[PDB]
Amino acid sequence: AEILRAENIKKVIRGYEILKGISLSVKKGEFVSIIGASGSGKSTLLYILGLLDAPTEGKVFLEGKEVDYTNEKELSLLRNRKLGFVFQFHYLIPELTALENVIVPMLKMGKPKKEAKERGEYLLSELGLGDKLSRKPYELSGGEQQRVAIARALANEPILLFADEPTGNLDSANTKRVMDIFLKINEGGTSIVMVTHERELAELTHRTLEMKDGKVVGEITRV
Amino acid sequence: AEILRAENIKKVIRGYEILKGISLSVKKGEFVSIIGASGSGKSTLLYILGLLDAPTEGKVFLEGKEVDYTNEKELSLLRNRKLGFVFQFHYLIPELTALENVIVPMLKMGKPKKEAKERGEYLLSELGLGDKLSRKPYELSGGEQQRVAIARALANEPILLFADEPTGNLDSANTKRVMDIFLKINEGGTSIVMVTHERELAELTHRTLEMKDGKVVGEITRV
Ligand SMILES: O=S([O-])[O-]
């Protein structure tokens, strides 16, 4: 069962072709990693696969259905319902508690606050933050902040989780903790597409796509 | 006096304030560094200051004149004629030789090819590439590729040069060489605004603006 498909993706910025024609497909349950050096365009690709930015050319299919870029508000809602994001930076709202930050995507779906908070507590508890539900971002360490972002990414049980160097700001201890969380999330059936410049992290995934100068130049499959 | 000034600059992306209100000034001839880590928003700020992206709120003044971000034509004219850019990646055109790569912005400005090549040859020679004018990017090392990018940045004798972690992809030897080039360029009278996360690089500049969570939180004056 294919969960995501990108066809002939190109991205041009100021006349420069960042992505030169990329096609790929992700199957349900796969943990994919995308690596590459400077100029690879790996993050630009991730933003397009995640429906954050529209490509210059090409199409994206989510669960077999072609994405409609005309209706941007509907696309934002589709993103919120089916996809989760974990960037290098936590992007937590400073005024909101850990729990309030996690329920944001749920409220966008029109979920009652009562039930949203119950699931939010569940998610935070599973990620080891059950005792810090009312803590605001300024009261959390880097590793805890990233875990709140992960809980938020899982808010609406996404079919796909996109991660852009999720452990970039973390020390070795939190890097292992976060990767283990991702492995557990994947074991739970959630597909993951993760960009990273760390081969050691890529080696823990099912498939690694290597990019160079806006093209996928190779792939290594580890079952 | 004032070569660049930004007032109340804010940048919002998908409802999140990447830049929460920034005001700063760069004196003519000054070499300023902006340092910050993840979440600082330093690169986003650089793109706005360099006219590559528009702010959500605020104004930018170049040479005392307010920039009109709604005028694409003027914006393109300003970037090409008054500014120079050096990113972590070289962004060279693979099909073009070093000299051809350097003269592109000159030809865009209407400069005669003969005169353009004369200046391009001068710039490349000054940057230690006088014997590699006909070499294409694939024939050059990463360090040499960046020097071509610096020559291109100086093509139209910009009054202000923007650099985003220009030595991030370079080893120690090349990083030192490139920084010496920037110091030499500033010694020539060209103003430079460089974003970096390296304290060592910032220490070589006249003044440093420290950023955190989309705000300028400190300033260090060394002269
Ligand atoms: O910017 S997205 O994660 O809502």
UniProtKB/Swiss-Prot annotation, chains A, B:
Biological processes annotated in GO: transmembrane transport
A Pfam family it matches: ABC_tran
UniProt keyword annotations, A-Z: ATP-binding, Cell inner membrane, Cell membrane, Membrane, Nucleotide-binding, Translocase, Transport
Enzyme Commission number: 7.6.2.-
Residues that bind ATP: G36, A37, S38, G39, S40, G41, K42, S43
Cellular component, GO annotation: plasma membrane
Localization per Swiss-Prot or TrEMBL: Cell inner membrane
Main localization category: membrane
Start and end residues of each ABC transporter domain: 4-223
Gene3D superfamilies: P-loop containing nucleotide triphosphate hydrolases (3.40.50.300)
An example molecular function term from Gene Ontology annotations: transmembrane transporter activity
Record's keyword annotation contains DNA repair: no
Bilayer topology term: Peripheral membrane protein
Function (record text): Part of the ABC transporter complex LolCDE involved in the translocation of mature outer membrane-directed lipoproteins, from the inner membrane to the periplasmic chaperone, LolA. Responsible for the formation of the LolA-lipoprotein complex in an ATP-dependent manner.
Complex formation: The complex is composed of two ATP-binding proteins (LolD) and two transmembrane proteins (LolC and LolE).
Homology family: Belongs to the ABC transporter superfamily. Lipoprotein translocase (TC 3.A.1.125) family.
Protein name: Lipoprotein-releasing system ATP-binding protein LolD
Source organism per UniProt: Aquifex aeolicus (strain VF5)
